[PDB]
Write a protein that binds this ligand. Structure first.
Ligand SMILES: *[C@@H]1O[C@H](CO)[C@@H](O)[C@H](O)[C@H]1NC(C)=O
Lengths: 205, 186, 505
């Protein structure tokens, strides 16, 4: 099923390339910025693993979310320019880090063989929605930054509370099918996407 | 007027021989202990009644069976002849046996026991199974004597989980085939 | 990915010509019985609907492999299907089928995979079928079967000395403990000679008890032989009889050999038949024993019909019918005892011969009959009185029903096929110990292969593990490719769509 691996890779990697080519990559040549963001993401993942080893499930998810937010904020503050463009250099870098992480190596070891579980296509779908989830996270970071009005800190706190929505939905599904769970994650992530774009049009001033 | 020989042909000695009559002749009958040759000399030859040569209940403790239990003989105008009865002695041994149902790899780590009932801490026989799924405890005597066959393996609980069977086979019979089943887990 | 254990069909060779399946590698889809190509595809059938015309169609179509899903219980299967599977077996086995035949055991996931394959095989419709084409692919493990060239067929022999003299007649009792069915690993063989080796063991116990004591120590040497290498043309008896006749000059198989008994499939059934290669000569020991047997079976137990069966030796068949044939070939008096009436009957082999197929009462009655006939002939009782209307084995020597049941359970506990019982396996070791506790001079004869024109070469890879890999054809995945292309186009449009939406606000 190598050609299945091909289809799954075409589903996963290609949207990142599309965003790369449709966001004006030549403005900063974000390859170095993306590499720095990926290094920061790896460091944050190592820190989260160390914290989990030191130390129930909600606390680990909260710590991981805090580390990811801190890394995204540092990456955004590393560069100055257009807000949408720091948004891109942060979110795309983090998403590429996630793809290079354990959603491509299992895609390699599994698939390409004889077995066919829908898990691989599900992983590709979840990796594609992780792009917009990290878009939401970068939007939260941008709201945190760009000066300090009109209950903006309250909205930022609401977005932070809504963060870790993936872990919340996973816990709910465990308490409550696999494709049904993936669909639920897609809809909640899309709802957070629309909430974040509403925040953006509120904050444009 | 016959012979009382053993199974192979050895002439039994000291076996009580008598003839018990039936019908009205039940009151007539004498006995005679056979000689070394097995040639009994029963007398009291009254015609008109059939005879039954058979083994006396008393004085025949050592001897267990008489395979032709009774011999119908017609008493005509002559004597009887060629009355042969074969007899078996009374075997006293128990000849214990019994297989074990277990996996092959657990067999070397097992020794079956023969704990006497009165004291389960002082075994009297500890035949090791070794590599064969059949123990043949040396023959015991049969008089009550409740026993145990606790299968005392060497495999400790530290690395496996198991329960050792226990079988009681109170010795009044003539054989036994205890079938201890040993199936540990984990 | 299910991982079940499949037991293969026989792959034995005799006298140079092959037998059974001759392949142990398969990597194909699992297309069960349907009007499709069925060529180079594993075919899944269940024993409940396993018809011989269907199986021959499968083999003639050159299937990749044939897998049969045996019911897990193997006892709750209806008896009519059991009889049909008895009649299917000898014809299925005696062929050079080049397609592997595997026998599996029912499982929940096995039922699921069979159901899905059955649904998919028989059946806008074309594109829907391609999209939902959940046909599993089954692959096995290991390499092809290799000729095991150093397999020693085992054999356990034990003696019983007479009373006095060096010229005593030597009655011989043999029984081939093994039993091959259509699957060596599934060939428990309870009603096969596995029920004859139990009677031999009980006879050993009883005659040891009788011989230990002097007053019942009859003058008749008894050579017991729990032979291995059985239904495979009785090689274990062949080698033993050759080594005790032409190689050496000692041993009891030449001095004054009396009748040579052989026991096989002596379990279930209400009829006992003593088979002979040639009629007994009047006045000899065989005729005396036959007369004692008929008197016992007619006076002691009238519930059994008894009759000689005189089958002339045939030197054209693949196997030598019974076991007494190999003895009668070397000018040695012999006859076989069996509940069967015709050697051509397929009641032997019979992977279906589960332990619950040999009734303990019938086995005890058969052992009583055989042991009493032997006791009467050995101890000269018949010309001593002792009318046949009363037995010898009443008390203190009764045939232990518990012992027979336990021995039968132990024999059925593990497969007894000649290709799986090692020269040092716990089965053989326990058999040797059991015979050693009652007999004298117990040893273990072995036949290797003669290394020239191999009399037998058993093959390996009989218990391969097979994987049930789920797979879908490439046409489904082409549909998925069109879908992901549509998704990528939508994503490409979505960037400008969202830019316009944000600009509109
Ligand atoms: C024992 O048997 C042989 C032949 O079967 C016979 O000649 C002999 O008379 C028998 N012995 C007795 C005591 O009947």
């Amino acid at each position: 099923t190598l050609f299945h691996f091909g289809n799954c890779f075409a589903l996963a990697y290609f949207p990142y390339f599309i965003t790369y080519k449709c966001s004006g990559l030549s403005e900063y040549n974000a390859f170095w910025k993306c590499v720095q963001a990926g290094v920061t993401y790896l460091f944050v993942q190592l820190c989260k693993m160390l914290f989990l080893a030191t130390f129930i499930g909600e606390f680990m998810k909260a710590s991981v979310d805090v580390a990811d937010l801190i890394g995204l904020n540092l990456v955004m503050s590393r560069n100055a320019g257009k807000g949408e463009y720091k948004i891109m250099v942060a979110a795309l870098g983090w998403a590429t880090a996630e793809l290079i992480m354990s959603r491509c190596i299992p895609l390699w070891v599994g698939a390409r063989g004889i077995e066919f579980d829908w898990k691989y296509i599900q992983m590709s779908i979840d990796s594609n929605i992780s792009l917009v989830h990290y878009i939401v996270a970068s939007a939260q970071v941008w709201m945190i930054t760009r000066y300090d009005h009109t209950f903006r800190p309250a909205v930022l706190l609401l977005m932070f509370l809504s963060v870790y929505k993936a872990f919340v939905m996973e816990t709910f599904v465990h308490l409550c099918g696999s494709w049904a769970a993936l669909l639920a994650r897609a809809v909640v992530t899309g709802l957070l996407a629309l909430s974040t774009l509403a925040l953006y049009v509120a904050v444009v001033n | 007027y016959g012979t009382v020989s053993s199974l192979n042909g050895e002439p039994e000695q000291g076996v009580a021989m008598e003839a018990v009559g039936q019908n009205d002749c039940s009151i007539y009958g004498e006995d005679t202990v056979t000689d070394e040759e097995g040639k009994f000399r029963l007398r009291g030859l009254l015609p008109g009644c059939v005879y039954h040569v058979q083994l006396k209940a008393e004085g025949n403790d050592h001897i267990e069976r008489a395979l032709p239990h009774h011999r119908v003989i017609e008493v005509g105008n002559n004597d009887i002849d060629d009355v042969n009865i074969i007899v078996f002695r009374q075997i006293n041994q128990f000849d214990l046996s019994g297989n074990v149902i277990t996996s092959s790899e657990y067999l070397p780590t097992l020794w079956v026991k023969l704990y006497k009932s009165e004291n389960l801490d002082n075994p009297i026989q500890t035949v090791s199974l070794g590599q064969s799924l059949f123990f043949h405890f040396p023959p015991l005597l049969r008089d009550g004597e409740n026993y145990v066959v606790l299968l005392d393996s060497t495999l400790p609980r530290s690395q496996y989980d198991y329960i050792l069977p226990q079988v009681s086979f109170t010795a009044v019979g003539y054989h036994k085939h205890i079938t201890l089943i040993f199936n540990p887990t984990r | 990915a299910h991982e079940f254990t499949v037991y293969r069909m026989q792959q034995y060779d005799l006298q140079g010509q092959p037998y059974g399946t001759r392949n142990a590698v398969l990597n194909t889809e699992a297309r069960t019985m349907a009007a499709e190509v069925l060529s180079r595809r594993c075919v899944l059938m269940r024993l409940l609907d396993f018809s011989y015309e269907q199986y021959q169609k499968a083999l003639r179509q050159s299937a990749g492999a044939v897998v049969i899903i045996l019911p897990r219980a193997m006892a709750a299967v209806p008896q009519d299907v059991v009889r049909q599977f008895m009649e299917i077996e000898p014809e299925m086995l005696a062929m050079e089928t080049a397609v592997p035949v595997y026998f599996a055991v029912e499982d929940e996931a096995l039922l699921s995979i069979y159901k899905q394959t059955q649904a998919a095989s028989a059946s806008a419709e074309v594109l829907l079928r391609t999209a939902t084409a959940n046909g599993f692919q089954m692959v096995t493990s290991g390499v092809q079967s290799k000729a095991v060239s150093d397999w020693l067929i085992a054999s356990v022999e034990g003696r019983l000395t007479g009373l006095g003299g060096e010229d005593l007649p030597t009655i011989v009792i043999v029984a081939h403990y093994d039993a091959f069915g259509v699957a060596p690993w599934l060939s428990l063989g309870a009603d096969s000679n596995g029920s004859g080796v139990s009677v031999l063991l009980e006879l050993a116990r009883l005659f040891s008890r009788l011989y230990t004591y002097k007053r019942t120590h009859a003058a008749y040497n008894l050579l017991f032989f729990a032979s291995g290498g059985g239904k495979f043309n009785y090689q274990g008896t062949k080698r033993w009889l050759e080594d005790n006749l032409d190689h050496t000059d000692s041993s009891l198989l030449q001095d004054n050999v009396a009748f040579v008994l052989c026991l096989d499939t002596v379990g279930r059934g209400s009829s006992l038949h003593l088979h002979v290669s040639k009629p007994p000569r009047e006045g000899t020991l065989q005729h005396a024993f036959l007369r004692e047997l008929e008197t016992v079976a007619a006076h002691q137990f009238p519930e059994v019909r008894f009759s000689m069966v005189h089958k002339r030796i045939n030197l054209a068949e693949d196997v030598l019918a019974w076991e007494h044939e190999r003895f009668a070939i070397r000018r040695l008096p012999a006859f076989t005892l069996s509940h069967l009436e015709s050697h051509r009957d397929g009641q032997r082999s019979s992977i279906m011969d589960v332990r619950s197929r040999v009734d303990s009462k019938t086995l005890t009655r058969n052992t009583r009959i055989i042991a009493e006939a032997l006791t009467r002939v050995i101890y000269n009782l018949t010309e001593k009185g002792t009318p046949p209307d009363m037995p010898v084995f009443t008390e203190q020597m009764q045939i232990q029903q518990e012992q027979l049941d336990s021995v039968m359970d132990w024999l059925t506990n593990q497969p007894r096929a000649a290709q799986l019982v090692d020269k040092d396996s716990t089965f053989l070791s326990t058999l040797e110990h059991h015979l050693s506790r009652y007999l004298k001079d117990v040893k273990q004869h072995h036949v290797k292969a003669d290394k020239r024109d191999p009399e037998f070469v058993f093959y390996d890879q009989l218990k391969q593990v097979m994987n049930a890999y789920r797979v879908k054809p490439a046409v489904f995945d082409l549909l998925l490719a069109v879908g992901i292309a549509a998704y990528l186009g939508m994503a490409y449009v979505a960037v400008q769509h969202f830019s316009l939406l944000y600009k509109t606000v």
